[PDB]
Paper text:
Perforin-2 (MPEG1) is thought to enable the killing of invading microbes engulfed by macrophages and other phagocytes, forming pores in their membranes. Perforin-2 (PFN2) has recently been identified as a novel and critically important component of innate immunity conserved throughout the animal kingdom and evolutionarily close to the last common ancestor of the MAC and perforin-1 (7, 10). Because of the presence of a canonical MAC-perforin (MACPF) domain, PFN2 has been proposed to form functional pores in bacterial membranes, leading to bacterial death and control of infection. However, unlike MAC components and perforin-1, PFN2 is initially synthesized as a type I transmembrane protein and found associated with the membranes of intracellular vesicles in which its large ectodomain (consisting mainly of the MACPF domain and a unique P2 domain characteristic of PFN2) projects into the lumen.
Residue numbers in the entry:
A (entry chain P), B (entry chain O), C (entry chain A): 31 to 539, 548 to 642
D (entry chain B): 311 to 369
């Protein structure tokens, strides 16, 4: 786009709608649109140039909120940088933006201080920039798309999902279509809930005081002299906690910039104020990719959909988030009435595993372990076996076969042959529940849980407590269970249930959703081939504390190539008489009846 | 248009009438007009150039409303950015602009604070820019039009509607014809209804105080000194809540800009102040598209009409919106006298489903489920079966058939054939109503509802309450029904009725409109192939709370190609002796008698 | 990139996401991306140019935190220079940044003064710069990658791990993908915990005082006059310890720079504010390196993974870090409930070694030593032998063989032949534990430990205490054990247990994790061929004191070439029919069936 | 001594470079031990050695 800047001496449009966007991480991950500047299309005013596949409608509407916008609960989270994306009725609208760099701070300021958040935003959005419907894709994005297509062609349903998760990590969860270019001047003013409970009838005065304080802090730079200083403003400042005036656009903010010099500061600076986009799985349509065939593009879109879904469900964590309730879970984003649900107590029953291995019995015996009570895969008397996960495990083993041909024993040289013998071993995890009123003595007491990735919240380290035996559940899931009841009673915590991605725990009252009852705090334990297993515990002190970080894709190490690579040179549909033949090129699909019939007669 | 800027050193007209416009989202979605600058046609003053297919009549009328414009109820919603579009007698004039970024804030400020909105607008509209009647269409818009035409040609009545909904998402619901270029300076000053009830005879003084406060806040930048400061102004500021001075045009606003420097700021900035346009389905006329045939263009216009209708009815939600009434529904946009209607109570009867599948019985048994009371598709004694939806469901299944030809067992290679076996399974949902005075013990109690898309407002999460069995209605509609009466009485809520897009519930008193009686709050449940099904519940606390977000098109995942693609090379009319023959090109329709008769003799 | 600076007179983007990043050392080690400037791609504003394989999304969001951010405990460590990397759920998220130049100072200020840290940060991040997914690698990084590949090809599994550790030392542990270019103005204000315990209800005032003090120190440069000076500010300054206003970006900070001149100072200066990247072992994918084969790249990635793991576990040290507890370990980064664990006391049992040498018995007898009590490899009565390490040791011996051919005894000249006879000697270390209640008289008392690398914390020098015999454990591990009980009782310290990388000590209660019980402080002793052995001691005064420095890779001297170099010209997979043939070039892998079958028939 | 690796010097052979690195290592060691002097460095103790750098509990 440098040729257009040379021909037209004016800065390029700063924020562009072309490119992927992540709802959780709250950042634009990658570029999904090519956005060529072959023709120097500019904004209707001589200020910014725009790519050819993007049109802009200049709104240039500047608002001056004289009073603050109060957010009582943080479940809504009317976000600043993206209000039209964190609000859509997506797969999960509640956790649409609950992992942002802004919402994390807002949450740690709202629950740890019992203080609602009030913002005084001055958003002078300049351009509502939008993508042209007939826009192409960027070379990197379409290259990753074609790579996922070729990997779905080679019957690698695990490697294709892994590459889709990598694409989401590199291109977000939503393709931005609309974006409100402009600037913002927000003061995320958190104020105690008791200040609103004492001024519920005078909330208008609270909002007015917040707004005038924002205004006089922006312009004056002097804290001893402000405008409209009253007693209620002093009480507001006294009940005020963690004030921060954040200018999302324009020249970087300081308490000295008069709002005239701030609004005039928007001449080159134009940041996304209200970006709105559709999910990327919906963006990849059969007409969007001309060379790639229709049904294959639809299968790839379904793969991207299920990968975005695995991203969402693994990222979000269900649990009550009511500040006053005792079973309040701080880490949870999406809240159900678990804290309000009747509290109970369950006795854990133990876990065992089965080995079904090809060869080399040393590797599956590591993941295989028996019960603590009985010592065998049989369920303890009085409990019911519940299935958790039925998938295969494999790790690569590098073997090199060397045969040396040595003449006169001085020309001796070693030449080898690298062989990678990936061994697959089926593994299944089972855990039982007290379906009957069995004695609590037999009831194993859950003491904690840890693997090499997460940290045991009870011990604050990747370690097994004293007196407990580590039980390897799948590969590295080390559950710590008490060999006896009393000596491990003070340290341990009542169990909540083990539920996985395919099958849930029966503890919720015969339908049983993938959740733990009795107001127990749920946490993730292990991810395995795009499937999660979760542990739930009593809502104690260790359930809260720190905020859970954002889990990022991919959710598995690169799956090894167990299946052989396939070349689906011919693609067919049973519904319609539509086919697609692969040319000698890598990705060049063309319609032809003779070639199709010939290659079909050859393959079958 | 850069050649005209080089030849004539002056900025281009900022806002243009060419382009689509969405009534609900309140933004210009896409460009429907080409707007070529082949001839450098300018405004009659040397300030802005205009496209060749657009003429402008300069009004340059500047108004200074010294007093505010009060809006008692928000049902009218005289919008700021578009007053001539949100007022037309369209398909739904009440919800014409009820999903705007402005109206949402106005509503949350009007009902949550019981405060009417008053605006002091200074709209100096400069140019009443209008489109030439003999104007062509943009390449992207006409390309999407031709795509919808070709898809209606291939007998894909579902994919064509999906592409029409996508076009509406990309080109809005109204093609703008007139637009009032200019700037605005509005103060959306919300003031309590009690302040107007106490000053009903002195509303003129309230409006004067609002206007003078707007004026002295715009110019002075000093809050301690204003002009015409009286006691009534102080009472107005005391009863004032969420003031915001929003300048829709010109240089971005700040409390320091004297209105002289604001009005002089309009030299390059020209935003749409009063945009007026006709719906896009009416814009696509037989004479608008020369190559595309007449009756096919009319069928495409009817498709766009029904798609805009599906957009509207799915977006809008009917329910009483009277602040004082107990059955007030906050989310509802269009209001009938439901809250004033006589309150009742109905006992829910249960839902069952039928499977009619081609092959592979595993997929339809997921959507098929029996009654909770009886356990069979038979209606419970004393109830009447009511039909909800009769449409087919299908999901794609990717199957690849591989036959390997391996010589010496070392040249072994796998070559497959991608086959997509879309399986269609007819599904029908039925729910019964207590036509007679049946016991309430048998009457199933509605506990809530959720799918993978929406969120259960009772549980605030996508989850089934404890003690309830999830009932899959169509694909993912998981209704939670109580197995017993008492234990689930405190959590559940009296039912309101299930009504779908094709058939409504008989609960409204034998004609039965698609609505729920007794002042019950209505909400959307599932969209399926452009058809909506709705659930209605007692107007409790959970019905209000947050405002319902804007539902966006398309209202279904891309429908799979079940029907075979067709090439209607010949098009005929039974009324008139008019035909249209397809040339070897993609879209090139030409009149010819010999070609028509020959190809007709060949096809039939 | 100088051609783009000549064509476009503007500074290059200062911080770039391309390049490796070390989590522990908290610095960008090396460059992992080539970042060519073949096309002069610039930022969307005329301020900075960017490499072709890097795109930037300008956020330009400037925040002004009016109140401080309090960190009660230093276990979370929300870092300033990298908040999105020290938070990810990596192999070890607790020690993700516990070896930074910032965290070391924060720790020595937090525990030695019992003072929590509060920061008032002004981070005006300008560009969220990100790497293109289809980006190549830098010549040096890909050269080191190819070197590790060739060394894994030559069956040097130790030299390959050594080169991987060297690469991590030269390219960090994480490949940066996202980076928030900008500036920061942070005041790491440490304040006593008693000041927060006395103002727990008034923590908002403490944060406000910290923020206003930051603001008035930044701008005024005069310490006698500040704004908003109250009594609580004076109490804050009285309880204040080690204040430091650190500007991470922009023009270097001084108390005179008004924040206007600081924010305006960001025109060329752009430092990483929030850098986010994935681990480098995950960055090296089969598609990232085209020439290098797939399974070999996967094996190299596993080698880099295990080398990063050895870096992490050797760097981190587990031990309780609770300030109030008596068993507080200052050096420990990751904390378990060891201090809270029941305190015990164990009697050390002694160490012996075995020699299994090829030839030249002088070298293994140095590492071999018998027990002090018994004087033989037999375990003392009442103890249980525990294995520590089973690996081979070797050191190079240079021998030159000279035979002189001298004519007339005056032409006499010496010509030799350098021969390097690396001698490998197997060595095993065993140490016993009092499995039974043996007398304490026989129980050897652990007096200390030292080698040539670390320093004995009891003697503060590499020396053996008087009256103790040095016991060489592996090569240089000189454990000092008491020959008697009483005379060495005052100097010595109760033992905690010897646990190594492969096998742990059985002192933790038959599973025994690699840890020491009873709240004993753990320290590293010796690293040997990528394996660590650790000694644990009673949590006394000498366990704290100074902070442990950062252990840096490689964790072994260059392993001698014991195994012969191999040329795996052919690489094969047993799962898929995929192979890779080496061309006469160094690293040029190409697919061919005839060449593969021929060379396979030749090698086997 | 660690910087001089077999790959750092291409012309010079591997084992000879390793022997030279061991020579540089032992020379740096002779530099260190000859430079440093062990002795107690506690100001209050009577046997305080001022010249000593590294301190053991000799005093
Ligand atoms: C394709 O992958 C699936 C899933 O692992 C497997 O069941 C099937 O046998 C594979 N087919 C071929 C031809 O590799
Ligand atoms: C909040 O304001 C009330 C009003 O007087 C005051 O009594 C109270 O002390 C304030 N709280 C704080 C924490 O300053
Ligand atoms: C066209 O579509 C309709 C609606 O699905 C269907 O009834 C009809 O059989 C189809 N005709 C052809 C020729 O595909
Ligand atoms: C509104 O104005 C009346 C007039 O005196 C006053 O009594 C009342 O307190 C005001 N309400 C608020 C909320 O300030
Ligand atoms: C390769 O190295 C391994 C590990 O030291 C050794 O066991 C094996 O014998 C070596 N093979 C060759 C051919 O050098
Ligand atoms: C901390 O502040 C309190 C409040 O008066 C004061 O009593 C105390 O002396 C202060 N501590 C220090 C170390 O200045």
């Amino acid at each position: 786009f440098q040729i257009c800047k040379n021909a037209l001496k004016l800065p390029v449009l700063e924020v562009l709608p072309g490119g992927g966007w992540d709802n959780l991480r709250n950042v634009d991950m990658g570029r999904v649109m090519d956005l060529t500047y072959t023709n120097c299309k500019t904004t209707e005013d001589g200020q910014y140039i725009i790519p050819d596949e993007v049109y802009t409608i200049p709104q240039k509407e500047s608002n001056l909120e004289m009073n603050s916008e109060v957010l009582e609960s943080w479940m809504n989270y009317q976000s600043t940088t993206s209000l039209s994306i964190n609000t859509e009725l997506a797969l999960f609208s509640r956790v649409n933006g609950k992992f942002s760099t802004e919402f994390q701070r807002m949450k740690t300021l709202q629950v740890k201080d019992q203080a609602v958040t009030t913002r005084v935003q001055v958003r002078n959005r300049i351009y509502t920039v939008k993508t042209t419907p007939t826009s192409e894709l960027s070379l990197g994005f379409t290259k990753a798309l074609m790579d996922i297509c070729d990997q779905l062609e080679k019957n690698q349903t695990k490697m294709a999902t892994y590459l889709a998760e990598l694409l989401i990590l590199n291109y977000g969860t939503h393709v931005i279509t609309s974006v409100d270019a402009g600037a913002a001047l927000v003061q995320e003013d958190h104020v105690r809930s008791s200040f609103l409970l004492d001024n519920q009838n005078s909330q208008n005065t609270v909002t007015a005081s917040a707004g005038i304080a924002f205004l006089n802090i922006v312009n004056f730079k002097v804290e001893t002299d402000y405008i409209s200083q009253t007693s209620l403003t002093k009480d507001y400042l006294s009940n005020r906690t963690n004030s921060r005036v954040q200018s999302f656009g324009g020249v970087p903010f300081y308490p000295g910039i008069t709002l005239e010099t701030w609004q005039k500061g928007i001449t080159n600076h134009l940041v996304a104020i209200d970006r709105a986009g559709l999910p990327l799985h919906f963006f990849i349509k059969p007409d969007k990719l001309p060379g790639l065939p229709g049904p294959l593009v639809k299968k790839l879109s379904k793969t991207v959909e299920t990968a975005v879904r695995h991203y969402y469900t693994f990222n979000t964590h269900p649990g009550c988030t009511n500040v006053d309730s005792p079973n309040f879970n701080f880490q949870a984003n999406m809240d159900d009435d678990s804290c309000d649900a009747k509290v109970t107590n369950f006795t854990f029953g133990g876990v065992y595993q089965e080995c079904t291995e090809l060869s080399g019995d040393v590797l599956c015996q590591n993941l295989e372990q028996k019960n603590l009570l009985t010592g065998d895969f049989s369920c303890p008397p009085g409990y019911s076996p519940v299935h958790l996960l039925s998938q295969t495990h494999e790790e690569g083993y590098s073997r090199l076969e060397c045969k040396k041909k040595c003449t006169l024993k001085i020309f001796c040289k070693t030449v080898c042959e690298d062989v990678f013998r990936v061994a697959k071993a089926e593994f299944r995890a089972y855990w039982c529940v007290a379906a009957g009123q069995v004695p609590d003595n037999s009831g194993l007491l859950f003491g904690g849980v840890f693997t090499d990735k997460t940290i045991n919240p009870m011990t604050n380290a990747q370690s097994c407590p004293a007196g407990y035996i580590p039980l390897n559940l799948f590969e590295s899931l080390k559950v710590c269970v008490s060999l006896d009841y009393e000596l491990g009673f003070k340290f341990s915590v009542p169990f909540g249930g083990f539920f996985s991605c395919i099958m849930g725990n029966p503890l919720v009252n015969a339908p049983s959703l993938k959740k733990c009852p009795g107001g127990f705090s749920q946490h993730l334990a292990v991810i395995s081939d795009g499937c999660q297993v979760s542990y739930c515990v009593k809502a104690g002190i260790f359930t809260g504390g720190s905020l859970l970080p954002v889990r990022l894709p991919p959710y598995t190490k690169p799956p090894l190539m167990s299946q052989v690579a396939t070349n689906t040179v011919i693609v067919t549909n049973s519904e319609t008489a539509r086919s697609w033949i692969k040319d000698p090129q890598t990705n060049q699909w063309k319609l032809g009846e003779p070639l199709e019939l010939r290659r079909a007669m050859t393959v079958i």
